[PDB]
Tab-separated table of C-alpha atoms in Angstrom:
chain	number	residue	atom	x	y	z
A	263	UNK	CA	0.000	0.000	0.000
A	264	UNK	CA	2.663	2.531	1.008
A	265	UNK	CA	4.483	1.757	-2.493
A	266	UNK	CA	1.367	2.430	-4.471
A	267	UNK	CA	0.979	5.734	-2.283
A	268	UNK	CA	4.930	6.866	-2.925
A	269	UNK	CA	4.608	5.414	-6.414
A	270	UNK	CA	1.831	7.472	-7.496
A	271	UNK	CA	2.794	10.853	-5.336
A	272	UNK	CA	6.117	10.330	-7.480
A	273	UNK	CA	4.389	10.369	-10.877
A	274	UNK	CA	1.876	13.278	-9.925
A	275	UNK	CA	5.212	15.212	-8.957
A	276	UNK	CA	6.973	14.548	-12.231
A	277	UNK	CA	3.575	15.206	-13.882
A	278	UNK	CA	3.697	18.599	-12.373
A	279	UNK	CA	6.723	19.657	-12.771
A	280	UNK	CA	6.340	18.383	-16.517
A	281	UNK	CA	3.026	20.730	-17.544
A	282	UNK	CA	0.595	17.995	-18.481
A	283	UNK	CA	-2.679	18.261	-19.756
A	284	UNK	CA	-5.471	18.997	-17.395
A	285	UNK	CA	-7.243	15.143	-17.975
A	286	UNK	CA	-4.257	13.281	-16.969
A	287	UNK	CA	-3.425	15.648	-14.053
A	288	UNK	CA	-6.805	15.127	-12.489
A	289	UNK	CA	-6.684	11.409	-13.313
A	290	UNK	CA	-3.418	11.154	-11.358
A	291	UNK	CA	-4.520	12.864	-8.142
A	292	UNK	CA	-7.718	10.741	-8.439
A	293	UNK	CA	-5.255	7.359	-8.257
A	294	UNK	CA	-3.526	9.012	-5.117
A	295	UNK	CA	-6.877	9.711	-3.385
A	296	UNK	CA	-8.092	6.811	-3.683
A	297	UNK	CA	-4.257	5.173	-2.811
A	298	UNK	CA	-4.512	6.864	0.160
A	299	UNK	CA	-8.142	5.712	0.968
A	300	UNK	CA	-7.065	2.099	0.432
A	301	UNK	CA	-4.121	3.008	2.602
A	302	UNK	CA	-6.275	3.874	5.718
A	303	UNK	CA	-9.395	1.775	5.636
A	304	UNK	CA	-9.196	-1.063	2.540
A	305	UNK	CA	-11.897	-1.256	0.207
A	306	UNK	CA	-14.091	1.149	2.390
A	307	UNK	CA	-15.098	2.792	-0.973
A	308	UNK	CA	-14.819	0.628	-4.613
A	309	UNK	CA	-13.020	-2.488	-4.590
A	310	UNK	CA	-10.865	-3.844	-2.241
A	311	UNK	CA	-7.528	-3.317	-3.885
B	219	UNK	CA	-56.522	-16.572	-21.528
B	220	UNK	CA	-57.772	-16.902	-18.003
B	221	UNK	CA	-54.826	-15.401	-16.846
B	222	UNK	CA	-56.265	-12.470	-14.575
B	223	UNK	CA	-53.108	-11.344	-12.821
B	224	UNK	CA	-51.162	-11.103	-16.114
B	225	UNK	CA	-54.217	-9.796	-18.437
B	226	UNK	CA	-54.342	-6.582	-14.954
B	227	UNK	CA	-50.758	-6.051	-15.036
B	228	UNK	CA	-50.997	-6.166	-19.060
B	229	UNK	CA	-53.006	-2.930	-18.349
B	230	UNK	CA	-51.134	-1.723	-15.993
B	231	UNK	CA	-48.026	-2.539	-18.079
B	232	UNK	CA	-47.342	1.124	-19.548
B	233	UNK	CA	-45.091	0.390	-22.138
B	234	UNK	CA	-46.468	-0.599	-25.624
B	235	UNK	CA	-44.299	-1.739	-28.747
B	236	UNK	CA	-41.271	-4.135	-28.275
B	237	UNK	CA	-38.848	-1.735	-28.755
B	238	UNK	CA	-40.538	0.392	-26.510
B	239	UNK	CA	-39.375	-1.882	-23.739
B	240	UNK	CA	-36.522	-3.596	-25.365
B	241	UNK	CA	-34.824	0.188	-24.312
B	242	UNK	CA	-36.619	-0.492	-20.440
B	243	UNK	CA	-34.311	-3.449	-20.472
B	244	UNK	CA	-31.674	-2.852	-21.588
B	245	UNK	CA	-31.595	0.959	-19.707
B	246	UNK	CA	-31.941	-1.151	-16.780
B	247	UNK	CA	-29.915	-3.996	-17.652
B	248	UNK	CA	-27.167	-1.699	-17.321
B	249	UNK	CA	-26.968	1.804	-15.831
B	250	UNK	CA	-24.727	4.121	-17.873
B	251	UNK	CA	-24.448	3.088	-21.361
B	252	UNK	CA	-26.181	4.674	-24.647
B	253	UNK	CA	-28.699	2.242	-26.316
B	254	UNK	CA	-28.609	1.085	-29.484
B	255	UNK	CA	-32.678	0.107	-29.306
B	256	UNK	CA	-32.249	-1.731	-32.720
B	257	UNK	CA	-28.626	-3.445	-31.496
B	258	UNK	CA	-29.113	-4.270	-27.849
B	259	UNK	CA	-31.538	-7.172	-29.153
B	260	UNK	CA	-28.605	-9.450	-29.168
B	261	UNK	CA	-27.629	-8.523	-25.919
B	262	UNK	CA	-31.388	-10.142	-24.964
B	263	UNK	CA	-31.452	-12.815	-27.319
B	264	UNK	CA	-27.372	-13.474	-25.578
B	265	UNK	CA	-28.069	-13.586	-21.764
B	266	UNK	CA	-30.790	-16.407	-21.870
B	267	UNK	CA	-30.312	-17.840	-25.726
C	223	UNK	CA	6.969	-27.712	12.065
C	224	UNK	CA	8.800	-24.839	13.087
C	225	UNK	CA	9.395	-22.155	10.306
C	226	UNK	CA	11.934	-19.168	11.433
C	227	UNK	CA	12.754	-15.978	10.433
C	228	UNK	CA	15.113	-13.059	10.834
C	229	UNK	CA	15.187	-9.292	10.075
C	230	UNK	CA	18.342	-8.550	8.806
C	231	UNK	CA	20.286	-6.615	11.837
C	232	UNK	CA	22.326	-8.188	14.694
C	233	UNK	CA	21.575	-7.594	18.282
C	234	UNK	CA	24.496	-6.386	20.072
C	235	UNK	CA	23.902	-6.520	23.974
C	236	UNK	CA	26.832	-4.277	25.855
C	237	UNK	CA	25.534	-2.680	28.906
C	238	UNK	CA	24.314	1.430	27.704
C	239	UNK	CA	27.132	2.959	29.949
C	240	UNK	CA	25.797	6.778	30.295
C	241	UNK	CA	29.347	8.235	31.190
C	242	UNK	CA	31.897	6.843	28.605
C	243	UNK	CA	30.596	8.489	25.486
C	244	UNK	CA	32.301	9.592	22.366
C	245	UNK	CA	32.624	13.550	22.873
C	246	UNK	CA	30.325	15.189	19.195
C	247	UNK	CA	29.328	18.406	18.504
C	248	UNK	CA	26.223	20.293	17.274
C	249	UNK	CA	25.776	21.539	13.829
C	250	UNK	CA	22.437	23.438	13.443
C	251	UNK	CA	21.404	23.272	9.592
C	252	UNK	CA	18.648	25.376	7.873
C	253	UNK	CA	16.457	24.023	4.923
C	254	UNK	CA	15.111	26.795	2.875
C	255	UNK	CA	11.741	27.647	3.872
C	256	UNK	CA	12.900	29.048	7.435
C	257	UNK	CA	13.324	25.456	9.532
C	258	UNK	CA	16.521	25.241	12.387
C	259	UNK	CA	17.425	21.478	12.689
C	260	UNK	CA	20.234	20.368	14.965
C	261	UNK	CA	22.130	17.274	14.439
C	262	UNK	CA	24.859	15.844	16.758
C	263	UNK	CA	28.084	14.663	14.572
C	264	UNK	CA	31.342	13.339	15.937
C	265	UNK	CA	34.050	15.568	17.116
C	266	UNK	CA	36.857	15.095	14.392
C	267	UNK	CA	34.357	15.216	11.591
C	268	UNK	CA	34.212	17.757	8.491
C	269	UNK	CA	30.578	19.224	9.292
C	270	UNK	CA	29.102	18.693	5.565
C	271	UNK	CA	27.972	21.767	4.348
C	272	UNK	CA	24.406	20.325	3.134
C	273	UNK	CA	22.735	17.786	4.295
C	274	UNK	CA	18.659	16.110	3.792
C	275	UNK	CA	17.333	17.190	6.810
C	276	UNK	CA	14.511	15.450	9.058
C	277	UNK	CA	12.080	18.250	7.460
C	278	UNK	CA	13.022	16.219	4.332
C	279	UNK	CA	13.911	19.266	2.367
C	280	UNK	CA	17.595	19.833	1.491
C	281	UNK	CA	19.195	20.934	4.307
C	282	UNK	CA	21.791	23.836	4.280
C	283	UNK	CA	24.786	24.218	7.096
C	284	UNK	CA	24.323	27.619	9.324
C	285	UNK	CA	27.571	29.548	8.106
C	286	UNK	CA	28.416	30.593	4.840
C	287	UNK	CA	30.482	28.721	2.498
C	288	UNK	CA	28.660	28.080	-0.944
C	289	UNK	CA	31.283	26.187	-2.581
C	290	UNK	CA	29.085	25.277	-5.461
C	291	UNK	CA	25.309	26.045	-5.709
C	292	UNK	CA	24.076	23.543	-8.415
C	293	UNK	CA	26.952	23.360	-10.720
C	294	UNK	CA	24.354	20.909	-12.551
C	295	UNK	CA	22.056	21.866	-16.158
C	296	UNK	CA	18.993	20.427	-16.952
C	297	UNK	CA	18.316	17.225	-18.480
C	298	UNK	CA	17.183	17.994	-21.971
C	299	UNK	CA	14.542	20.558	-22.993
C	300	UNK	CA	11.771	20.016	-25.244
C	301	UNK	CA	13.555	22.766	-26.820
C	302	UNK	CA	16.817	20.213	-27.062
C	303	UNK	CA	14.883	17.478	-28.225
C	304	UNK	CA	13.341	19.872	-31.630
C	305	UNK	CA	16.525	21.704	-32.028
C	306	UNK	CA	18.842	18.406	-32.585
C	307	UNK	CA	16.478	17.305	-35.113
C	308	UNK	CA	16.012	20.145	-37.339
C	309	UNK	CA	17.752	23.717	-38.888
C	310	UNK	CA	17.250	27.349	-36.792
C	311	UNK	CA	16.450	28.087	-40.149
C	312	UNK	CA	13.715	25.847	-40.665
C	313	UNK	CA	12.375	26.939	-37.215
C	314	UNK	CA	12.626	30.547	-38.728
C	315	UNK	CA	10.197	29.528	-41.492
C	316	UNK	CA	7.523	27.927	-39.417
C	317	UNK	CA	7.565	30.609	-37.352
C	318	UNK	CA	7.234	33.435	-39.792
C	319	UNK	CA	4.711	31.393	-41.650
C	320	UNK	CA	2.844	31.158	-38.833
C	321	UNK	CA	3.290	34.545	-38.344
C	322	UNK	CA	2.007	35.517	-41.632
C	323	UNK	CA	-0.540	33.188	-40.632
C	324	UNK	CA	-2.162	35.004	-37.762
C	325	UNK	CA	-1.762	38.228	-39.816
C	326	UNK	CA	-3.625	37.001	-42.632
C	327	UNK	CA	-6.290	35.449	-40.802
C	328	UNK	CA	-7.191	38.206	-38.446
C	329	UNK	CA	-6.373	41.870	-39.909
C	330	UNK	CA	-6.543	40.848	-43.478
D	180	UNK	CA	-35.626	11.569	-31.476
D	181	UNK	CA	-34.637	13.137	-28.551
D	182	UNK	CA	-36.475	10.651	-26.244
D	183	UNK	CA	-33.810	8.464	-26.181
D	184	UNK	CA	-31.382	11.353	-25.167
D	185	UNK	CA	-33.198	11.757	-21.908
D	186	UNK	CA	-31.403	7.955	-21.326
D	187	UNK	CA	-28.298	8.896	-22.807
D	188	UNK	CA	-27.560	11.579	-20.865
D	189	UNK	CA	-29.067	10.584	-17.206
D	190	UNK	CA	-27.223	7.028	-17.936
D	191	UNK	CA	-24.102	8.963	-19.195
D	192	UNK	CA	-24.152	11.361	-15.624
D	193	UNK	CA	-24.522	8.163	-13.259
D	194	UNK	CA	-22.236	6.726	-9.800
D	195	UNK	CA	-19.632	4.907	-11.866
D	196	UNK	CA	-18.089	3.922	-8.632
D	197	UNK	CA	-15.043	2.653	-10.821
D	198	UNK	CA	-12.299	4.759	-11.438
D	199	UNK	CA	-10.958	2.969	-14.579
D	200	UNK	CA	-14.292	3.529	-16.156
D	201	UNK	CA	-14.341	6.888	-14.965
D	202	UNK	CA	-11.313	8.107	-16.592
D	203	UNK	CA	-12.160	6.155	-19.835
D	204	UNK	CA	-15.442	8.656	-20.412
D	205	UNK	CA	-13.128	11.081	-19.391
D	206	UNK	CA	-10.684	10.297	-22.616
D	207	UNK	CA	-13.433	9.602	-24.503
D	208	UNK	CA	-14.669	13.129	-24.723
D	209	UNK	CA	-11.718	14.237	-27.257
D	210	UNK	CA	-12.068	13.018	-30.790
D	211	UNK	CA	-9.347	11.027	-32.611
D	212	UNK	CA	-7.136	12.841	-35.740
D	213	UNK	CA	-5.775	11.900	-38.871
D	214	UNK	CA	-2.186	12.945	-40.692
D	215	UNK	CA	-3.131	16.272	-41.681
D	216	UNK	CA	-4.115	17.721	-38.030
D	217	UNK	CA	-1.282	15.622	-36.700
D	218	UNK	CA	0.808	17.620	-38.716
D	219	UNK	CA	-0.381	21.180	-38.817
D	220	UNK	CA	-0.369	20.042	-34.682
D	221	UNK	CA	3.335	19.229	-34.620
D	222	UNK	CA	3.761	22.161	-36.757
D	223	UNK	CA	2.329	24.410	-34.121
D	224	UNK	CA	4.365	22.640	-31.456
D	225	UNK	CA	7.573	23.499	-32.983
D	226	UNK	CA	6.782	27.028	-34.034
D	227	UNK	CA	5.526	27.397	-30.221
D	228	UNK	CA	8.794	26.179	-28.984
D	229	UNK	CA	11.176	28.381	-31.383
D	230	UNK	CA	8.451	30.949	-30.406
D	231	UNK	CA	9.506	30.967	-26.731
D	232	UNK	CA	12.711	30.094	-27.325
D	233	UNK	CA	13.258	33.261	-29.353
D	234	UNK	CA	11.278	34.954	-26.651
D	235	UNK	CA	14.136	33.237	-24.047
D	236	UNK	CA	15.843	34.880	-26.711
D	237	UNK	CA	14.634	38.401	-25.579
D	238	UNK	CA	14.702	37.961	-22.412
D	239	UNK	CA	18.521	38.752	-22.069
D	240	UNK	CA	18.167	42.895	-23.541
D	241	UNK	CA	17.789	41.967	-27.096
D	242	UNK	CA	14.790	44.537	-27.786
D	243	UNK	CA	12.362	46.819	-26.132
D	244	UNK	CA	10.024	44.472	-27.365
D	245	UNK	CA	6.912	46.290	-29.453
D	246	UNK	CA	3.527	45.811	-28.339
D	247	UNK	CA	2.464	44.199	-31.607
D	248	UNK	CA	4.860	41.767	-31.365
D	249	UNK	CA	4.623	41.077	-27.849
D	250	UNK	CA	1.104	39.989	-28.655
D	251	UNK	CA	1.474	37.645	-31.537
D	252	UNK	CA	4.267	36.557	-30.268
D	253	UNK	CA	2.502	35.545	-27.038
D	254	UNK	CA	-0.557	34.081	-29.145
D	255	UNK	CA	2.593	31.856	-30.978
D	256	UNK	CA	3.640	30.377	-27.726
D	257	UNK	CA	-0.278	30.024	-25.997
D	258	UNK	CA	-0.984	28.298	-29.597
D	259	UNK	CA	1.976	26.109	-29.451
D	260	UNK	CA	0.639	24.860	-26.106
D	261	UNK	CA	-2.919	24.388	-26.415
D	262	UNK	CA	-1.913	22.266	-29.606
D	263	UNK	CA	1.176	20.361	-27.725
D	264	UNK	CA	-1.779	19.375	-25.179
D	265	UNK	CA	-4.489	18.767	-27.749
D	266	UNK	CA	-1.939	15.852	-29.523
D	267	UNK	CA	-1.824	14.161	-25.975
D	268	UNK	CA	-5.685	14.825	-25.193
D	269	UNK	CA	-5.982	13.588	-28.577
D	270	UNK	CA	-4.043	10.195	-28.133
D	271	UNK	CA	-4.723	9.044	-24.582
D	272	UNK	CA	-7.068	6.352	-26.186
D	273	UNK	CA	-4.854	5.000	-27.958
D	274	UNK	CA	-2.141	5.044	-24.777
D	275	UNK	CA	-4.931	3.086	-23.062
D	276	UNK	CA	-5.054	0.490	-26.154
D	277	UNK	CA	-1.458	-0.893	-24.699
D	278	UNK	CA	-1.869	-0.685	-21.692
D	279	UNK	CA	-5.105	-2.952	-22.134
D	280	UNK	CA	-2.824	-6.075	-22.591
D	281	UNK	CA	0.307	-5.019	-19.934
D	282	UNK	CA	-2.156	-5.779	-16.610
D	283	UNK	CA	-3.057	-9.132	-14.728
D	284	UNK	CA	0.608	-9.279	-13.716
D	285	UNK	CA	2.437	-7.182	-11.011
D	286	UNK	CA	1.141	-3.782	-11.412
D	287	UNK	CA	-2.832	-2.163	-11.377
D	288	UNK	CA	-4.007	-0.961	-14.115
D	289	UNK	CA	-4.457	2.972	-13.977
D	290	UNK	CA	-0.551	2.779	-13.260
D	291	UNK	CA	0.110	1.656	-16.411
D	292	UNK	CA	-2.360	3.953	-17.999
D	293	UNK	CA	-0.138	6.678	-16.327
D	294	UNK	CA	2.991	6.007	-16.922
D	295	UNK	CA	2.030	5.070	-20.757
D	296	UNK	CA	0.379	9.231	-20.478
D	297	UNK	CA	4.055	9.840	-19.518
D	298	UNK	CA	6.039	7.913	-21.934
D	299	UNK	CA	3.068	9.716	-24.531
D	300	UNK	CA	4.289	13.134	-23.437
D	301	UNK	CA	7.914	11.952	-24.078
D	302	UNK	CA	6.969	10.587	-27.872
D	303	UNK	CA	5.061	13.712	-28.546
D	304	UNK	CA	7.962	15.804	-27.641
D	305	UNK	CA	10.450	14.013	-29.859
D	306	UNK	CA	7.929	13.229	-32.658
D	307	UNK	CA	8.850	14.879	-36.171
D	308	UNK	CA	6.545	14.848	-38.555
D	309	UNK	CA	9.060	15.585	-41.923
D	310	UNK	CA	9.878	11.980	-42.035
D	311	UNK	CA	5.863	11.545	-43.686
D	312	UNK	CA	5.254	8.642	-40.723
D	313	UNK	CA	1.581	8.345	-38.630
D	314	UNK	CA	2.265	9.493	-35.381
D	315	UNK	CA	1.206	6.326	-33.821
D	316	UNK	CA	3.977	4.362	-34.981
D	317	UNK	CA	6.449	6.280	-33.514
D	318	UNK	CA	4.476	6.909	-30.617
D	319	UNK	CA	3.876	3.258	-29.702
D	320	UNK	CA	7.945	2.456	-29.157
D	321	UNK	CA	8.047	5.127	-26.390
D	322	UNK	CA	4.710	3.913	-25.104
E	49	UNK	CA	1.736	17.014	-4.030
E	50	UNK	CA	-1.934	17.554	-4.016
E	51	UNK	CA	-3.971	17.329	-0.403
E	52	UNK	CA	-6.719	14.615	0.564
E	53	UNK	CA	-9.313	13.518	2.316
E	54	UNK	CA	-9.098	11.162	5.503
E	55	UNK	CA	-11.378	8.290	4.272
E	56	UNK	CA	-12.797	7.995	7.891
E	57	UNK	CA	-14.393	11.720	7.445
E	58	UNK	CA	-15.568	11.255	4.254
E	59	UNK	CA	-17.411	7.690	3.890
E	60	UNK	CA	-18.297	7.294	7.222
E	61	UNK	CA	-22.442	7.235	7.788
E	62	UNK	CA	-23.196	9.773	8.064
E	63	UNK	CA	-20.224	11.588	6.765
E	64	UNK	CA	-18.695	14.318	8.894
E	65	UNK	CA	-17.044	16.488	6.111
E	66	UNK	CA	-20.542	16.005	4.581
E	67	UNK	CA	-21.940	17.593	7.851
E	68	UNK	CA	-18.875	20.230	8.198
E	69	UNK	CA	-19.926	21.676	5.020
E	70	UNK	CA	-23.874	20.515	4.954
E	71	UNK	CA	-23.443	18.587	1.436
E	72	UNK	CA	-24.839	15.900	0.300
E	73	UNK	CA	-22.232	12.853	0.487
E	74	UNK	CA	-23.150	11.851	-2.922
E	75	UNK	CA	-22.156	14.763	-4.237
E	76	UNK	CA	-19.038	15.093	-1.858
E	77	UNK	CA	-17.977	12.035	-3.538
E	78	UNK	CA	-18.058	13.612	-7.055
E	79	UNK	CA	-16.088	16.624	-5.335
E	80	UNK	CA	-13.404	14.799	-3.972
E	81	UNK	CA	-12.820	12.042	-6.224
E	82	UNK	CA	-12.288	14.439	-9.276
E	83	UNK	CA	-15.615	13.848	-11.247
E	84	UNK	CA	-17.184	16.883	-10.371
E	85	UNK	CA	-16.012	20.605	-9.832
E	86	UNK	CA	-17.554	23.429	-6.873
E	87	UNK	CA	-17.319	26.908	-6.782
E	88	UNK	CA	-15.433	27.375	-3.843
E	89	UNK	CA	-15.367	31.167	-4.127
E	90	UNK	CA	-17.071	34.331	-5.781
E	91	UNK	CA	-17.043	37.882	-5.624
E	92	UNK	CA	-20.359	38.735	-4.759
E	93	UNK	CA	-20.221	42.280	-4.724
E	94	UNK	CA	-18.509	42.475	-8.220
E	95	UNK	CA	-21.180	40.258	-9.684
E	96	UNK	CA	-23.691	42.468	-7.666
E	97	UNK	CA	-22.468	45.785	-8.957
């Protein structure tokens, strides 16, 4: 879980820092919310990962 | 023919022509998808047939 | 049946004698964003000048040396990537045909 | 007619707990290209980059910089952008085509959506267009 | 890189960021998890005038 939460902070860094389009931007910190929900209380909300 | 339940419900049924429902069906058979009233036949005539 | 494991450190047991300790010094360090942290080095030890603080920012030592900043360029630019596959001139044309371009299309 | 609409719509503005299926009618919104727009797009691309690099150019004192062509010069660069970020709007689908086959082993599968959108932003930059080639056969190496 | 949203005050029932801001947790969910914007702020008295 923590990997998935570093691994996709990482990426929405670089995507930052990069200038990317507004879709994939919003699709990233959508991955890292729900990372971080599946980080604190697993598959409360969708699937279990 | 004696069928009293069905022939009350067949008045109460609301929905008239077979495409007419065909689209209740599918609509419902999956939320969040455009119909194709013509092409979601198959998807009847492929769940039971 | 018995299945072991071990993390991978040793377990020295001395006794934690409070008196007979290594002399060290204090080095407060500053990251950038106004943050004092204090870390206790040994005595005959060059101080580092930076250093990844507990704030997890870089880390900078309190006095003033600044023996090199970054001495470090960027990767590549997009810029890098189009200019080592084409002419300044050919960049020249797009752009004044592009220039043209805009004229044409919006003052006539 | 429009009957049907009322489902389309209501259907299409639903829960879609699901992420993955969120950000594919999020992708799908943007309509695919063909050779010509990929290459008046790359064309833009490059004249935004020599556009702000000639602007870089400026920035040193090179010229007290006339208000004309401050602003075409500034619509250059703006246009360079928008287009440099339509090509990627425009080819996420196709960065999701790959990664349809890469999952079921090790990694989810919005990761590898994202880090194909990342390798797409690398092919994009070093796409050229004079060499006549689709863009999605150079793109798909990098992806 | 980008804040978030404890999943205990958020999908709890009832939901106490959907009470801190009187919302309706439905569409909290479409705030938070990128499918939906809010106006967060406005100028009222420059719209007014």
């Amino acid at each position: 879980l923590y990997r998935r939460v570093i691994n996709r902070n990482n990426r929405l860094k670089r995507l930052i820092d990069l200038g990317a389009p507004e879709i994939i931007v919003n699709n990233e910190k959508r991955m890292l919310q729900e990372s971080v929900d599946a980080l604190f209380d697993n598959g409360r909300r969708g699937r279990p990962v | 023919g004696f069928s009293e339940i069905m022939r009350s419900t067949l008045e109460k049924d609301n929905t008239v022509g077979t495409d007419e429902a065909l689209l209740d069906i599918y609509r419902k058979l999956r939320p969040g998808e455009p119909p194709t009233k013509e092409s979601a036949q198959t998807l009847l005539e492929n769940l039971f047939f | 049946r018995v299945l072991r494991g071990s993390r991978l450190g040793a377990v020295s047991y001395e006794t934690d004698r409070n008196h007979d300790l290594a002399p060290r010094q204090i080095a407060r360090y500053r990251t950038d964003n106004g943050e004092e942290f204090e870390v206790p080095f040994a005595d005959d030890a060059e101080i580092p000048g930076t250093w990844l603080c507990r704030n997890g920012m870089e880390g900078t030592l309190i006095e003033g040396d600044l023996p090199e900043p970054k001495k470090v360029k960027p990767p590549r630019t997009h810029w890098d990537m189009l200019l080592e596959r084409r002419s300044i001139e050919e960049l020249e044309e797009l752009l004044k045909e592009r220039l043209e371009l805009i004229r044409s299309r919006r003052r006539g | 007619s429009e009957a049907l609409r009322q489902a389309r719509k209501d259907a299409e503005l639903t829960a879609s707990a699901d992420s993955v299926r969120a950000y594919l009618k999020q992708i799908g919104k943007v309509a695919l290209l063909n050779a010509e727009e990929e290459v008046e797009l790359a064309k833009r691309i490059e004249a935004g980059l020599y556009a702000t690099q000639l602007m870089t150019e400026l920035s040193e004192r090179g010229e007290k910089l006339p208000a004309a062509q401050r602003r075409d010069m500034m619509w250059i660069c703006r246009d360079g952008d928008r287009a440099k970020n339509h090509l990627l709007e425009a080819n996420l689908r196709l960065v999701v085509s790959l990664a349809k086959r890469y999952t079921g082993r090790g990694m989810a599968f919005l990761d590898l959506i994202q880090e194909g959108n990342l390798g797409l932003i690398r092919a994009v930059e070093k796409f050229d267009y004079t060499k006549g080639y689709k863009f999605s056969t150079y793109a798909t190496w990098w992806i | 890189a980008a804040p978030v949203t404890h999943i205990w005050y958020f999908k709890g029932v009832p939901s106490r960021l959907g009470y801190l801001l009187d919302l309706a947790p439905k569409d909290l969910e479409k705030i938070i998890y990128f499918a939906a914007y809010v106006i967060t702020s406005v100028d009222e008295e420059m719209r007014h005038n």
